[PDB]
Structure 1
Amino acid sequence: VGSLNCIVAVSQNMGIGKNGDLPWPPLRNEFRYFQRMTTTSSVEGKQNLVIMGKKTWFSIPEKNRPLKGRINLVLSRELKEPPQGAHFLSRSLDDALKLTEQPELANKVDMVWIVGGSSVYKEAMNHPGHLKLFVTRIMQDFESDTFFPEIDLEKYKLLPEYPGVLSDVQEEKGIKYKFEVYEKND
């Protein structure tokens, strides 16, 4: 099993979601960026694993459920089996990560991507160890009901560039955004 990573798109006021949707209108290339970063795996013969909470899973349109080319794990304590189209179900983030080291997955998983929501981000980010945050900064305020947790910059170093990540400002539908990578190791 390779690195542990979070990936998120967040508005200036730290919003990630509103009523099960994005706070902003669809940004097609931002979605393509999310698809590319979580799907691309260098290690031959393996796939990355995506971890998400239940509400994040049901936010994805059925057309894109499961996220293709990746192993899909859903976090829930109420569900008794993985939702339709999902691959795995765990009752805690710790259980999910431990599962990646079981023989069932031991040599199939390259990178692990936490793709939401807020509680899963928070726990991963505040758990000691080596972690990266791939953060798309939507550079406008958007009305939201779900927020990304605080990034402790004493711990998380903003990297000055990163291979495969555009450093310049993007713009879709009149909305400017930029890609960032943070890294901690504690």
Structure 2
Amino acid sequence: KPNVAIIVAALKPALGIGYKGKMPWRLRKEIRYFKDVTTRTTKPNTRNAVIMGRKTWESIPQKFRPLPDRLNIILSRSYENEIIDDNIIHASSIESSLNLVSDVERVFIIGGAEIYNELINNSLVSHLLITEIEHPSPESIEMDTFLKFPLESWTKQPKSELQKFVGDTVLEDDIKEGDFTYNYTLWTRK
């Protein structure tokens, strides 16, 4: 089996993630956390996979595309299940994409909304890496895109389990970037 996790940054308490196809924030440490965790492998001869919707792919800046050091899987309902090049796979589903290569250690679902809100209730996903973002006045930030997670069916793990998961990665508490404050968290199924 492949270890499949969801990684996302969301604003509490509504868990908003975007506005008009855009990200409502630019968090410099968070971006860097995202990179290190999705890239890091333990075993040699392995890579990690990043799975995403077509729209999230289209929104990734030209030069960061495909996301380096990781296998990129792009999801569309139009896609045949084929390898485009060494770094890029097109797929109809996660299940179809997993049966396409075997060099993968960890699989990370990286967005967007339609992808998250569907794969949250898929049994393959065993971990959630949610960056919980806070703001003194959350409603002042314009938001039309939200997570629909039944978090009552999941367990927020201790920091020690997250540290285990992300290896040596530095996990700072209450990161203050402008008016935003955030923490990295780990969730497992009940």
**Take 1:174 and 1:83, find their aligned partners in 2: how far apart are those partners?**
42
TM-score if structure 2 supplies the norm length? 0.83
Structure 1, gaps ≥5 residues long:
100-104
Q: 1:24-56: per-residue Cα shift (whole Å, max 9, x none)?
A: 2x1111100110110001111110000000111
> Following TM superposition, by how much is the alpha carbon of 1:132 offset from its aligned partner in structure 2, in angstroms?
0.4
Structure number having the greater helix percentage:
2
1:125 corresponds to 2:120: yes
What is the count of residue pairs matched by the alignment? 177
TM-score if structure 1 supplies the norm length? 0.85
> Following TM superposition, by how much is the alpha carbon of 1:109 offset from its aligned partner in structure 2, in angstroms?
0.6
Partner of 2:184: 179
Structure 2, gaps ≥5 residues long:
164-168
**Take 2:170 and 2:147, find their aligned partners in 1: how far apart are those partners?**
21
**Take 2:56 and 2:127, find their aligned partners in 1: how far apart are those partners?**
20
Q: Would the aligned equivalents of 2:50 and 2:73 in 1 still touch at CA under 8 Å? A: yes
Identical pairs, percent = 35
- Pairing of 1:6-85 with structure 2 (within 5 A): 6-12=6-12, 13-24=14-25, 26-78=26-78
> Following TM superposition, by how much is the alpha carbon of 1:58 offset from its aligned partner in structure 2, in angstroms?
1.3
Q: Would the aligned equivalents of 1:27 and 1:173 in 2 still touch at CA under 8 Å? A: no
Partner of 1:143: 142
**Take 1:46 and 1:152, find their aligned partners in 2: how far apart are those partners?**
31
**Take 1:37 and 1:148, find their aligned partners in 2: how far apart are those partners?**
21
Give the ranges of 4+ consecutive aligned residues of structure 1 lying more than 3 Å apart after TM superposition: 78-86
SS in 1 for 2:158: coil
SS in 2 for 1:36: helix
What amino acid is aligned across from residue 98 of structure 2 in structure 1?
A: L
